[PDB]
RNA sequence: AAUCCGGUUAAUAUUCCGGAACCAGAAGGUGGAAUCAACACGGCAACGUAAAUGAAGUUGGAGACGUCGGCGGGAGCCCUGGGAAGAGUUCUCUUUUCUUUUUAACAAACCACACCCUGAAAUCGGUUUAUCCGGAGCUAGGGUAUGGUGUUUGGAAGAGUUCAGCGAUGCUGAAUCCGGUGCGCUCUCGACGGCCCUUGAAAAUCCAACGGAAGUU
């Protein structure tokens, strides 16, 4: 599993046709873990700003299947 | 910084080694000066949106600068107020690109 | 006193190991940048291939093409030889400015290449241009 | 507790200390090498026996 | 707790090398670890070379070229001192031959 | 060459289910890199890096190598201080008695023995538990590589376990913590020191070197 810190990169990987689904995890420290499932690696992005998580959420392309807390 | 560790874009107009690159503090313009004597002025405009890739385009190629000892433009500075460029050459000349 | 400008020497350390060079200028006095017996050397990296009359003129030039290199190396990493080569265009072209300024460094590499070619065409210093087997 | 172990520990502290006074400048290289040299022959059975040796030196 | 071997290769040998690890299920498990890699050794002197990762023979293919060789003559095959010794000996031998031929021709 | 965790059966699990990886081969494609100065640059150097062609022919390395002792490192286990949870015991005494308190493969960034550079040393220095090395260049300073490991995560709490409940076996709460350690035991690695003499298998397989054939589109 790959940990990605660059949000834009997470967007580009999401726009890649390889990405199949994404998961949103709400941790007790109020972090949102965006886990994007690709062919070979599960790319995770931990965002500390809550509003950043929501503004991240609909910037994800609609075709991608986002999921609630696992 | 939010895209990748690798460079987002690569530009190789210059025929000689690129000496200095300066970004205007306010205006969305940056300049590159090299030993070829030509200064490249590019329009680099940045959005705060995540999906919005910054728009980088060339704007001008400033020429008519002397070359001494295979040295051209050494340093370039941006005026803090408007689109004015200070270019220092190897001939002892300073150019006001207004 | 065995190190003089124009003397043919041999690099024994670094990437250019075992390559024949000519001492462009001696800085045995040392410098703050290089606190040792460093001397600027211009040598041959890619030794020229054997010119044969059968090959065409374009082929002839390409084989004659020589890749030079200008480097600052310590004295103990160099080995001097009895052989010495003197060429006028390689007097004073080298200095601190040239090794600092990348375009001047590129320009210096151009001239030392050009002067090596004319010397090869003139058929002088064949042994220096000849690679050494080890 | 084995006699090998007590000497095993005693030599290290004696050696570990003798280095530390050396870098602090209390003793030069020459007397430290001597102090290192006798300590190999169990000259001091405990740490403070050696520290008094520096003061008298 | 007493743990058994994962495999059925009884009579544990050099090949049977295991490590004890604690799993997220709170279980102690045998993990078989392959033998450590070996760094390449110099041809002339025999000391392991400097700058080459110590990995397995089959693994070495995955590395790039620059990660398996050193940017010098005989790089990745001979040490720097061995290269220096090789170069100076070759030149001295050549000079000894050139003076010997000079003595014979005169 | 290359796999781990959790779950699952009346009976099979590194095989199945869920999740997460890895290796080997295969083609094109995309992007990046080098060249009409023909096959990259930098560093005094050890060497470094996103790349950076190499025919015939010639070599080198890994595979691949005895045994013993001590020292150092790490992990697990054992010991134990608190924190929490439950079950005790309790006229009184007893901050007490007993039990539990998890992080895998893999993927990321960083974190110490050989060598290089300055240096020329005995008034001998550095140093092991065990005196070993030094003009065949010590101590000292600055570097290079090898990273045994450790740090921070990701995997990953969504899992597992333990307590409370509420209602097909579901749902909801919490906690799953901070230490200290030792000639301790088990396993492994590094650095030495002996004894050897018996100077300590082979091959498949993989890599590198020298070599320089060939070569605006």
Swiss-Prot record, chain B:
Q: Which family does it belong to?
A: Belongs to the WD repeat BOP1/ERB1 family.
Q: What does this protein do?
A: Component of the NOP7 complex, which is required for maturation of the 25S and 5.8S ribosomal RNAs and formation of the 60S ribosome.
Assembly state and interactors? Answer: Component of the NOP7 complex, composed of erb1, ppp1/nop7 and ytm1/SPAC890.04c. The complex is held together by erb1, which interacts with ppp1/nop7 via its N-terminal domain and with ytm1/SPAC890.04c via a high-affinity interaction between the seven-bladed beta-propeller domains of the 2 proteins. The NOP7 complex associates with the 66S pre-ribosome.
Parent-protein start and end of this portion? 643 to 740 of 740
The ranges of the WD repeats are 13-52, 68-98
Highest taxon of the lineage: Eukaryota
What protein am I looking at?
Ribosome biogenesis protein erb1
What does the UniProt entry say about where the protein is found?
Nucleus, Nucleolus; Nucleus, Nucleoplasm
Q: Where are the transmembrane segments?
A: none
Swiss-Prot record, chain C:
Which SUPFAM superfamilies does its entry note?
A: Translation proteins SH3-like domain
Location in the cell reads:
Cytoplasm; Nucleus
Q: Example GO biological process term?
A: cytoplasmic translation
This protein's source sits in the domain of life called Eukaryota
Q: Which GO terms describe its cellular component?
A: cytosol; cytosolic large ribosomal subunit; nucleus; preribosome
Question: Keywords assigned by UniProt?
Answer: Cytoplasm, Nucleus, Ribonucleoprotein, Ribosomal protein
What CDD domains does the database record attribute to this sequence?
Answer: KOW_RPL27
| Gene Ontology molecular function, alphabetical | structural constituent of ribosome
Please tell me where this protein is predominantly located: cytoplasm
Task: Specify whether Ribonucleoprotein is a keyword of the entry.
Answer: yes
Q: Which Gene3D superfamilies match?
A: 2.30.30.770
Q: How does it assemble?
A: Component of the large ribosomal subunit (LSU). Mature yeast ribosomes consist of a small (40S) and a large (60S) subunit. The 40S small subunit contains 1 molecule of ribosomal RNA (18S rRNA) and at least 33 different proteins. The large 60S subunit contains 3 rRNA molecules (25S, 5.8S and 5S rRNA) and at least 46 different proteins.
Also noted in the record is: There are 2 genes for eL27 in S.pombe.
What is the role of this chain? Component of the ribosome, a large ribonucleoprotein complex responsible for the synthesis of proteins in the cell. The small ribosomal subunit (SSU) binds messenger RNAs (mRNAs) and translates the encoded message by selecting cognate aminoacyl-transfer RNA (tRNA) molecules. The large subunit (LSU) contains the ribosomal catalytic site termed the peptidyl transferase center (PTC), which catalyzes the formation of peptide bonds, thereby polymerizing the amino acids delivered by tRNAs into a polypeptide chain.
Protein name (Swiss-Prot/TrEMBL)? Large ribosomal subunit protein eL27A
Q: Which organism is it from?
A: Schizosaccharomyces pombe (strain 972 / ATCC 24843)
From Swiss-Prot, chain D:
Q: Where in the cell is it found?
A: Cytoplasm
On subunit structure and binding partners, the annotation says: Component of the large ribosomal subunit (LSU). Mature yeast ribosomes consist of a small (40S) and a large (60S) subunit. The 40S small subunit contains 1 molecule of ribosomal RNA (18S rRNA) and at least 33 different proteins. The large 60S subunit contains 3 rRNA molecules (25S, 5.8S and 5S rRNA) and at least 46 different proteins. eL19 lies in close proximity to the binding site for eukaryotic initiation factor eIF4G.
State the family it belongs to: Belongs to the eukaryotic ribosomal protein eL19 family.
The remark listed among the other comments is: There are 2 genes for eL19 in S.pombe.
* Job description of the protein: Component of the ribosome, a large ribonucleoprotein complex responsible for the synthesis of proteins in the cell. The small ribosomal subunit (SSU) binds messenger RNAs (mRNAs) and translates the encoded message by selecting cognate aminoacyl-transfer RNA (tRNA) molecules. The large subunit (LSU) contains the ribosomal catalytic site termed the peptidyl transferase center (PTC), which catalyzes the formation of peptide bonds, thereby polymerizing the amino acids delivered by tRNAs into a polypeptide chain.
Name listed for the protein in its UniProt record = Large ribosomal subunit protein eL19A
Organism placement in taxonomy: Eukaryota, Fungi, Dikarya, Ascomycota, Taphrinomycotina
The primary gene name is rpl1901
Q: Describe which stretch of the whole protein the shown chain covers, with first residue, last residue and complete length.
A: 89 to 145 of 193
From Swiss-Prot, chain E:
Instruction: Summarize the subunit comment.
Output: Component of the large ribosomal subunit (LSU). Mature yeast ribosomes consist of a small (40S) and a large (60S) subunit. The 40S small subunit contains 1 molecule of ribosomal RNA (18S rRNA) and at least 33 different proteins. The large 60S subunit contains 3 rRNA molecules (25S, 5.8S and 5S rRNA) and at least 46 different proteins.
Q: Which PROSITE patterns match?
A: RIBOSOMAL_L34E
**Residues of the signal sequence?**
none
Locations listed in the record: Cytoplasm
Query: Note on file?
Result: There are 2 genes for eL34 in S.pombe.
Q: What does this protein do?
A: Component of the ribosome, a large ribonucleoprotein complex responsible for the synthesis of proteins in the cell. The small ribosomal subunit (SSU) binds messenger RNAs (mRNAs) and translates the encoded message by selecting cognate aminoacyl-transfer RNA (tRNA) molecules. The large subunit (LSU) contains the ribosomal catalytic site termed the peptidyl transferase center (PTC), which catalyzes the formation of peptide bonds, thereby polymerizing the amino acids delivered by tRNAs into a polypeptide chain.
Coding gene?
rpl3401
Which InterPro entries does the entry mention? Answer: Ribosomal_eL34, Ribosomal_eL34_C_sf, Ribosomal_eL34_CS
Q: Which UniProt keywords apply?
A: Cytoplasm, Ribonucleoprotein, Ribosomal protein
Question: Which protein are we looking at?
Answer: Large ribosomal subunit protein eL34A
A GO biological process of this protein is: cytoplasmic translation
Chief site of localization: cytoplasm
The UniProt similarity line reads: Belongs to the eukaryotic ribosomal protein eL34 family.
């Amino acid at each position: 599993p790959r940990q990605i810190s660059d949000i834009k990169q997470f967007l580009e990987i999401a726009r890649r046709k390889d990405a199949t689904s994404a998961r949103i995890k709400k941790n007790t420290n109020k972090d949102v873990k965006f886990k994007l499932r690709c062919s070979k690696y599960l790319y995770t992005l931990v965002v500390a700003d809550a509003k950043k998580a929501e503004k991240l959420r609909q910037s994800l392309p609609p075709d991608l299947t986002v999921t609630e807390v696992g | 910084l939010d895209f990748s560790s690798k460079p987002y874009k690569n530009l190789r107009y210059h025929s000689r080694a690129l000496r200095d690159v300066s970004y205007h503090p306010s205006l969305p313009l940056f300049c590159s000066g090299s030993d070829d004597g030509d200064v490249q002025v590019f329009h680099g405009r940045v959005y705060s949106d995540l999906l919005a890739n910054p728009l980088i385009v060339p704007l001008k190629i400033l020429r008519n600068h002397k070359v001494v000892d295979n040295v051209g433009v050494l340093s370039t500075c941006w005026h803090p107020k408007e689109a004015w460029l200070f270019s220092a050459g190897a001939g002892g000349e300073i150019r006001m690109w207004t | 006193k065995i190190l003089k400008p124009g003397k043919v020497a041999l690099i024994t350390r670094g990437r250019f190991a075992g390559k024949k060079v000519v001492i462009l200028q001696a800085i045995d006095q040392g410098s703050k940048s290089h606190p040792f017996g460093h001397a600027v050397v211009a040598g041959v990296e890619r030794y020229p291939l054997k010119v044969t009359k059968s090959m065409g003129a374009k082929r002839i030039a390409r084989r004659s093409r020589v890749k030079p290199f200008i480097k600052v190396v310590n004295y103990n990493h160099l080995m001097p030889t009895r052989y010495a080569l003197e060429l006028d265009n390689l007097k004073g072209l080298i200095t601190a400015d040239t090794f600092k300024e990348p375009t001047q460094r590129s320009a210096a590499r151009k001239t030392v290449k050009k002067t090596f070619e004319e010397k090869y065409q003139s058929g002088k210093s064949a042994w220096f241009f000849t690679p050494l087997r080890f | 507790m084995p006699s090998a172990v007590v000497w095993m520990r005693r030599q290290r502290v004696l050696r570990r200390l003798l280095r530390k006074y050396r870098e602090s400048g209390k003793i030069d290289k020459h007397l430290y090498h001597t102090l290192y040299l006798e300590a190999k022959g169990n000259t001091f059975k405990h740490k403070r026996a050696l520290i008094e040796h520096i003061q008298r030196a | 707790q007493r743990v058994t071997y994962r495999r059925r290769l009884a009579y544990n040998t050099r090949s049977n090398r295991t490590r004890i690890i604690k799993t997220p299920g709170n279980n102690i498990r045998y993990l078989h670890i392959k033998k450590l890699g070996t760094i390449p050794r110099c041809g002339d002197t025999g000391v392991p070379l400097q700058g080459i990762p110590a990995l397995r023979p089959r693994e070495f293919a995955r590395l790039s070229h620059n990660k398996k060789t050193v940017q010098r003559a005989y790089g990745g095959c001979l040490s720097a001192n061995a290269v220096k010794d090789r170069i100076v000996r070759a030149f001295l031998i050549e000079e000894q031959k050139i003076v010997k031929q000079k003595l014979k021709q005169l």
